[PDB]
Design a protein around this ligand. Sequence first.
Ligand SMILES: [Li+]
Ligand SMILES: [Li+]
Ligand SMILES: [Li+]
Length: 35
Amino acid sequence: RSCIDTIPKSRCTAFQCKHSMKYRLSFCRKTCGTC
Ligand SMILES: [Li+]
Ligand SMILES: [Li+]
Ligand SMILES: [Li+]
């Protein structure tokens, strides 16, 4: 599986996924639902 978060997912906060492109696209692609 290629779809992963690159940081601990406890820090892949909904707060960040909603509005930070770096979270959506770099750090939290899985938890934010990009992949
Ligand atoms: Li936890
Ligand atoms: Li963070
Ligand atoms: Li924290």
